[PDB]
Structures are given as structure tokens and as C-alpha cells.
Amino acid sequence: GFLVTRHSQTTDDPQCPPGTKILYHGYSLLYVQGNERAHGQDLGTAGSCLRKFSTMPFLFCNINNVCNFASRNDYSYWLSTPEPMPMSMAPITGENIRPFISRCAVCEAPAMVMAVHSQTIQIPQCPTGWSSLWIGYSFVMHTSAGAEGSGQALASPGSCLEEFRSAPFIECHGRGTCNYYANAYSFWLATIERSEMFKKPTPSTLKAGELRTHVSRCQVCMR
């Protein structure tokens, strides 16, 4: 019973890769933050694909047998779409949030699925005996409020996003608001020239148009 989760990074349901069957579609959950502590769900697993969305998909209980829902100051983070940040740059609420949330598909595969990374701008070949499911960019971790966050396993399909985005996720709050913030950081595997492996890294500051020049590529494969 092998499973693979795919994220469209758009408001449309992604399609199950060739050879796999759909189980269900949902919204792309990246991680949550309760009592200021972050806990993520690997993007390559079904845990990152929830059928129902909410800026507050969880609640907390105490040893006094009292549970509180949306009653403190907690967060939820979701993979986002190409929808531009509002001109007002103010938080988004209610139905206006829907255009920003990524969709996902949980599919059952005949065999084991994995991701491989080239650590170069070229797409890495699937290991011998493995077939391609999709290609993308090496997404490894992220941080936001309080510099808290989580990341992906490098052999998980979750570490391979098909669409590169400087801002691949949006931040939501128990109060019902969501927005992008300047400290929302996305970390990606970088390109490394073989001759530079044991040499001091050469610093690079990339702007729109040249961002992908140092981002490693990947391919998700199935045995």
C-alpha cells in the first residue's frame, strides 16, 4: 500500500502521476504552530493533504479537562498559489483566502516512490529501474513567525516542488486572517560545482529573473 502525495501549487486539483490511482483531493498543509511551537507534515505524505481547510484546523486541551479552539494565538501554514499578494498588503480573510491555497492529491502507487536531487541546474535522472512521476525544484525547509518552521526529507517526494516560488507558502492565524510576511523564508538545496565541494562557497544575491540559477533540481520516481 505505497502512497504518494502531489501538490498542484494552484487552486486546481493536481492529477495523480501515471501509474498511480487517486484516493482523495484536499488542501496543502505545510505545518502548524501551537503555543509558539511548530510541527510540520512531510509534503510527500497524506498528512500534508487535508480534505477540509481552516485557518485553525486544530485545538488544544489542558490537564484540567478544558479544551480551547481558536482561543489563543496559534497558526497554520499552507502551500500557496500564484495569486499575488493584495495591493493593500493587509491580511486576507474568509472566502478571499481560497484563491491562495494550494490543492493536493493522495495517490496509491504500485511500488516505492522517492525523490532524487542533482544539486545542479540540470534535472537528475531517475535511478536505473525507476520511472518518472514528475520533476521540480529541491525544497528542503522553511521558517516564518519566530523563525520556527519545519522541512522535508530529501528522499521524499515532498522535497520536490514542481513549481519554484520565492514564497511557496502562506501564513494563517486562529483569528481567521492569512498573509505573506517578509520573514517567510523558503530554503532550497543549492547548486554545487563538483570542483567547489571542498572550497569556500562563493556568495550570491539573486533577484527576479536569476533566482533559479542556484536552485537544485529534482525528479520524483517510482520503482
Binding site: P127, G151, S166, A182, H214
Partner: protein, 222 residues
């Protein structure tokens, strides 16, 4: 299924006979970005990086700006028996310090079993042993960042016990070094048979340590 092996030496490990090697690389323990650790399970292929670099990642902000080796981030890797330097090692000198790994294609899933005893635990019936080691649980270094291993994962069972099984590489500096705040945590050898409600504090010096570290075995069915 994939079997991952870390040699804990500067020589890549051999895949068990009958298992094809998908690739060899360097033992990645974790990345530290914005003072937040992100670990790779030592039993998973993601902990075996084909190409090494003191700064193997970059980061971007929503303003469509990405920075590579332009701040103060770092990386951590499993290390070898190369002697602790009195000062950071740079570029080519780093090579002898980084552990190597191999990702092998296996017939079944491999697990780790722990005894929490000086006795080496047997593999479940119907499972064969791949290797024996010590119960590696977690680690911390700069600040209180670090991480740990899954006890059922082969990554929690290292063949060679090391007081400091990993090294710190300071990203943009292009150097790696052993700092005094590095800590390795291991499961203990418990004197009691199965319940210890009152631990007896102890300080162990080099030479009396290994007999106090929980033992483990990595196993695969068949």
C-alpha cells in the same frame, strides 16, 4: 526499499552483497537556517548527499530575492576519526573529517532494535542481522538546535560509538570545526530488567563509556 549505510570514515561503505548501490555521498546530519535545525533521518536516503559543501542550501524571501552563503547559516555532518583540530579546518582539509555513505536497493525494509542493556539485542525471528552498533538518540550543538534519530530507523544504530559523532561546518566561512557545546545523546544500559523509576546519577570518563551505551542491531526480514 532502500538501505542507507554511513561508514563514519572517509571511505564510502560497501552495500550488502546482492544489493545494488544507487549512489554514494556524504553523511548529512542537519542544516541550520535562521538558527533553526532541519534534520535528515540517518536511515533514509536524504541523509546521503552526493555533493558536499559547507553551505549546501540557499534561502529566499517573498520579495523574490534569494541569498546563497550570504548570511550566517551552517551545516552539520556525521564525522570520521580524524583528530579534533585546535582550530577550524578549511576547504581541502575538511575532506578527511566527513563521513561517507551509500544508498543501496534492498529486498525488504531494515529496522533497528535496541536493548537498553549491555547485551546486544536479537533480531526478530525471521529477520537477519545487517550490523550491530550503539543506540544513537539525539544531538545538539550551536544554541539548543540539533535533532535526533528514529529508534526503529537504521540511523539510530551506529556501528562505531563516538562521543562526538558529527562536525559543524560554518557555511559561508568554508570551514568546519568541533566546538565545546556539541553533545551526543545515547540510550543507556539500564541495570534493572525492565523498570527504572530511580536513576543513579553517574559521570563516565573515556574508557568506561562503551559498556554503558545501549546496544542495537539493524535487521532485515529473510
Amino acid at each position: 526499499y532502500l538501505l542507507v549505510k554511513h561508514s563514519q570514515t572517509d571511505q564510502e561503505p560497501m552495500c550488502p552483497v546482492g544489493m545494488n548501490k544507487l549512489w554514494s555521498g556524504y553523511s548529512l546530519l542537519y542544516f541550520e537556517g535562521q538558527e533553526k535545525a532541519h534534520n535528515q533521518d540517518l536511515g533514509l536516503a536524504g541523509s546521503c548527499l552526493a555533493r558536499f559543501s559547507t553551505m549546501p542550501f540557499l534561502y529566499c524571501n517573498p520579495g523574490d530575492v534569494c541569498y546563497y552563503a550570504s548570511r550566517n547559516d551552517k551545516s552539520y555532518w556525521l564525522s570520521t576519526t580524524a583528530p579534533l583540530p585546535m582550530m577550524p579546518v578549511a576547504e581541502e582539509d575538511i575532506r578527511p573529517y566527513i563521513s561517507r555513505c551509500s544508498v543501496c536497493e534492498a529486498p525488504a525494509v531494515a529496522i533497528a532494535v535496541h536493548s537498553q542493556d549491555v547485551s546486544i539485542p536479537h533480531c526478530p525471528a525471521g529477520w537477519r542481522s545487517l550490523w550491530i552498533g550503539y543506540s544513537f538518540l539525539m544531538h545538539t550543538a550551536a544554541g539548543d538546535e540539533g535533532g535526533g534519530q528514529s529508534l526503529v530507523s537504521p540511523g539510530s544504530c551506529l556501528e562505531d560509538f563516538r562521543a562526538t559523532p558529527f562536525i559543524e561546518c560554518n557555511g559561508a566561512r568554508g570551514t568546519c570545526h568541533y566546538y565545546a557545546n556539541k553533545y551526543s545523546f545515547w540510550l543507556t544500559t539500564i541495570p534493572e530488567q525492565s523498570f527504572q523509576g530511580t536513576p543513579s546519577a553517574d559521570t563516565l570518563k573515556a574508557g568506561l563509556i562503551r559498556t554503558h551505551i545501549s546496544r542495537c542491531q539493524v535487521c532485515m526480514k529473510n
